[PDB]
């Protein structure tokens, strides 16, 4: 029973964070200041994602944040090295704090972090490589990144495959999908929900099996490849601490698919250039794990392919056409019914759908260049609309008051990615038919 989104929703991205800062299941913001007011700690996951999303060239106007019941955080130094003042930002019930640990080994740093016991309500529990922070029933705690080399991890009693059906029921006016959980089960559940609700799933992973040799691997990229979904995946080193899905979305949220524009070379502020070697790049390209290569002193995305090998822009264009046609038909049918002139099921009224559909969804694409037109061979690329006649409508469909088998056809006008040249240098230059072929 998927209800349709509208134009504003087509740009709104949703991030499924863990927190308890508001009672609702979802809220919308137009800047990080509102989230700060709601008690999100600077450097917290949702804050980072919102900053990245607003920091893009094609940034969206509003960002939606979901809620998943939080249980307890973690400040993990395991496997890290630190020779700098470690700092952690903590917000407690609208009270904002800062924590400082000087300089030494990660275990010593973690133990010394237990000093976060003053002016508190909340509790801190060191464990030799990480500190587990747990709040108390009435207290609310937000823990955010600072200057230290550490990653913040959250845990919850819920699961995505059960939280999402609540968020969508609460509100459905959003298109992109993202999550904080990074387990394979959570990622696959998100992909399966998104593919069923016609939403684009995005995710960043740091697993080295993306680099692993093509001969064999068992990474989430490979699982999605096998299942043949459309989730857009990318491999980044800093994903687990920066949630760069926001940066990815910020480079594609605002440009409409009517231009047929792709994602091949767009700069994404906040991302960190890929570091592996050319063999690793070749390996990754096989799994459809897009990378952010740094070239000629700048950063550039690479080829934006989905899990099943298809390009992202074709999928997005098809979805845009779907939503635009839905909206246009609803608008026209509602205007017709505002007057006492409702559209009847007769041959004197049915054809008008041709112009109604030509106007809003299709003609804009033909104008802007996303739809190919012209002549091929013995075929033409012009979009076509076919509508049935009253004689062909089944009596059961007449009784149910439903119209079926309205068909449309188009051609997509893809963009260019690669170029090859055959230059030649010579010290000099060397049949004369001169007859028209």
């Amino acid at each position: 029973g998927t209800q349709p989104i509208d134009t504003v929703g087509f740009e709104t991205p949703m991030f499924l964070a863990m927190h308890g800062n508001f009672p609702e299941r979802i809220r919308f913001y137009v800047s990080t200041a509102g989230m700060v007011a709601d008690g999100f700690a600077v450097g917290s996951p949702a804050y980072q994602f919102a900053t990245n999303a607003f920091a893009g060239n094609f940034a969206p106007q509003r960002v939606a944040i979901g809620r998943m019941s939080i249980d307890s955080s973690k400040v993990d130094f395991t496997g890290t090295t630190n020779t700098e003042q470690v700092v952690v930002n903590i917000t407690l019930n609208k009270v904002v704090k800062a924590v400082k640990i000087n300089v030494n080994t990660p275990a010593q740093i973690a133990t010394a972090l237990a000093d976060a016991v003053t002016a508190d309500k909340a509790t801190a529990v060191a464990t030799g490589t990480y500190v587990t922070v747990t709040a108390v029933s009435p207290n609310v705690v937000s823990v955010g990144k600072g200057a230290g080399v550490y990653k913040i991890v959250n845990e919850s009693s819920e699961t995505v495959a059960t939280v999402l059906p609540s968020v969508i029921a609460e509100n459905h006016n959003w298109y992109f999908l993202a999550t904080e959980a990074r387990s394979d089960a959570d990622i696959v559940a998100a992909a399966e929900f998104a593919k069923a609700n016609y939403k684009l799933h995005i995710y960043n992973s740091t697993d080295v099996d993306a680099y692993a040799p093509e001969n064999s691997a068992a990474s989430v990229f490979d699982t999605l490849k096998s299942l043949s979904y459309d989730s857009l995946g990318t491999s980044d080193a800093g994903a687990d601490v920066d949630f760069t899905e926001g940066s990815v979305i910020g480079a594609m949220a605002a440009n409409d698919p009517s231009y047929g524009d792709s994602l091949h070379l767009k700069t994404m502020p906040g991302m960190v250039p890929f570091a592996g070697s050319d063999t690793q790049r070749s390996n990754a390209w096989s799994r459809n794990a897009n990378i952010y290569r740094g070239l000629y002193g700048g950063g550039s995305y690479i080829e934006g392919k989905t899990s099943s090998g298809q390009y992202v822009d074709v999928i997005r264009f098809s979805h845009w056409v779907k939503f635009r046609m839905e909206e246009s038909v609803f608008a026209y049918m509602k205007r017709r019914s505002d007057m006492g002139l409702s559209m009847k099921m007769s041959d004197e009224d049915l054809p008008v759908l041709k112009s109604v559909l030509m106007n809003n969804p299709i003609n804009i694409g033909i104008r802007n260049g996303g739809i190919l037109t012209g002549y091929d061979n013995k075929v033409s690329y012009d979009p076509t609309i076919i509508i049935p006649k009253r004689a062909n409508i089944p009596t059961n469909d007449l009784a149910a008051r439903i119209l079926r088998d309205v068909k449309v056809e188009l051609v997509y006008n893809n963009s260019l990615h690669y170029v090859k040249i055959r230059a030649s240098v010579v010290l000099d230059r060397p049949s004369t038919n001169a007859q028209t072929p």
Binding site: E348, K389, S424
Partner: protein, 215 residues
């Protein structure tokens, strides 16, 4: 196997289409001129196919599977309606307006039907003496319809299985060179020669460089 609806079917069904619409709108009773019966009781309408006009040159040709030809011609049939009692002029008028009502037409004049309505003439009201005692009310009008008639040929010509052509090339170096050319139904000019090799599509491979130049 490629059948159709000849003229006889269309012409006969047009009368009944007019008959039902007159009955269903005016509420009067209907009768044709084809056979005579004692005059009915109460108001009623009389239908007659007064005239029929052809259009000279055929508009479409449909070729059967075996080659037989079916030709289609446009026509225009005129029907004379007469209403004999009650308020006859009112009765005929409601027939005229019926052709403007969408739902009512669809019952009897569905889209794609082989006949259609064109126009109507003036409705004249008349008073006719009877037995030198009474004046009877009447009326008359002519309704013009469009139609299309299809008929089937009585055979076909033979096909061209073999063609022989003689050629003579006059030139100054000697007498004209005589040479012939021929065609046969199943004989391709080149037999089944594969022709030149095609230009292959290169396989899809990974490229490190966006634009690479190699000497």
């Amino acid at each position: 196997p490629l059948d159709f609806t000849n003229s006889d079917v269309v012409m006969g069904a047009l009368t009944k289409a007019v008959g039902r619409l007159c009955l269903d709108v005016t509420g009067y009773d209907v009768v044709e001129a084809d056979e005579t019966i004692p005059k009915p009781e109460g108001p009623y309408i009389l239908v007659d196919l007064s005239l029929l006009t052809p259009l000279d040159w055929a508009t479409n040709e449909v070729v059967d599977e075996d080659g037989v030809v079916h030709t289609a011609h446009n026509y225009t049939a005129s029907y004379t309606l007469t209403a004999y009692r009650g308020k006859p002029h009112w009765a005929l008028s409601r027939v005229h307006q019926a052709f403007g009502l969408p739902f009512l037409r669809e019952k009897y004049f569905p889209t794609g039907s082989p006949y259609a309505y064109s126009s109507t003439s003036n409705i004249a009201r008349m008073r006719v003496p009877l037995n030198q005692q009474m004046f009877e009310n009447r009326a008359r009008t002519i309704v013009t319809f469009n139609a299309t008639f299809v008929e089937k040929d009585l055979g076909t010509f033979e096909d061209i299985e073999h063609i022989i052509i003689g050629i003579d090339v006059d030139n100054p170096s000697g007498p004209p060179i005589g040479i012939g050319a021929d065609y046969d139904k199943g004989v391709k000019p080149g037999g089944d020669d594969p022709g030149l090799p095609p230009k292959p599509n290169p396989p899809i491979v990974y490229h490190d460089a966006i634009a690479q130049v190699c000497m």
